[PDB]
Structures are given as structure tokens and as C-alpha cells.
């Protein structure tokens, strides 16, 4: 049904947003750490 | 080099992947039960 499609896509967006923000947070930190280590 | 760095990062990677799997597990269950709840509504 339509309600099903609406609700499942809501859930998919919620899950994916949370996972991608974690991926971004870790990648930004690793990039910064690598950059800081190259200083010395 | 740098083994020191990589040893740290591998621990970080496991923490990250554990969090991601934990999220995936939760949302997979949520998906299942959401589908059930809708049918039975």
C-alpha cells in the first residue's frame, strides 16, 4: 500500500541518515588526525 | 610506519563498524515489525 511505501521510506531515510553521519564523523576525525600527525 | 597509528585506527574501525551494525540490526527489526503493524491495521 501507499501508507506502507511512505512509512518504509521514512524509516530508510532515518536509518541511512544516522549511518552516514557516523561514517562522516569518523572520516572527518581520521582526516584531521592524519593531517595533525604529518605536522611532526 | 606507522604501525602505531594503524593499530589505533583498527580499534576505531571496530568501534565504528559495531555501531553501524547495531543500528542496522535495530532498523531491520523495526522494518519487520512496522510491516506487520501496518498489515494488521
Quick structural overview:
Helix content of chain A is 90%, strand content 0%. Chain A has one helix at residues 2-37. The longest helix of chain A has 36 residues, at 2-37.
Which structural traits does this protein have?
homodimer; 40 residues; mainly alpha; Single alpha-helices involved in coiled-coils or other helix-helix interfaces; 1 helix; 90% helix; 0% strand; rod-shaped
Written overview of the protein:
By secondary structure, chain A is mainly alpha-helical. Chain A has a single domain, classed as Single alpha-helices involved in coiled-coils or other helix-helix interfaces. Helices cover 90% and strands 0% of the residues of chain A. The first copy, chain A, is built from 1 helix and no strands. Chain A is rod-shaped, with a radius of gyration of 17 Å. The first copy, chain A, starts with a helix and ends with a helix. It is classed as apoptosis. Keywords: apoptosis, tumor suppressor, coiled-coil, RAS association domain family. The assembly is dimeric.
Helix content of chain A: over 70%
CATH-level-2 architecture of chain A: Up-down Bundle
Number of strands of chain A: 0
Which pair of protein chains has the largest interface, and what are the residue counts?
A-B, 17 and 15 residues
Q: Any idea what the shape of chain A is?
A: rod-shaped
* Count of discrete domains of chain A: 1
Output the number of helix runs of chain A. 1
Distance between the termini of chain A: 59 Å
Structural category of chain A: mainly alpha
Assembly form of the protein: homodimer
* CATH level-3 fold name of chain A: Single alpha-helices involved in coiled-coils or other helix-helix interfaces
Helix and strand run of chain A = H
* Alpha-carbon Rg of chain A, integer: 17 Å
Q: Tell me the major beta sheet of chain A.
A: none
Beta-strand portion of chain A reads under 5%
CATH class of chain A: Mainly Alpha
Amino acid at each position: 500500500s501507499p501508507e506502507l511505501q511512505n512509512f518504509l521510506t521514512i524509516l530508510e531515510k532515518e536509518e541511512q541518515d544516522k549511518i552516514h553521519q557516523l561514517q562522516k564523523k569518523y572520516n572527518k576525525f581520521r582526516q584531521k588526525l592524519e593531517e595533525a600527525l604529518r605536522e611532526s
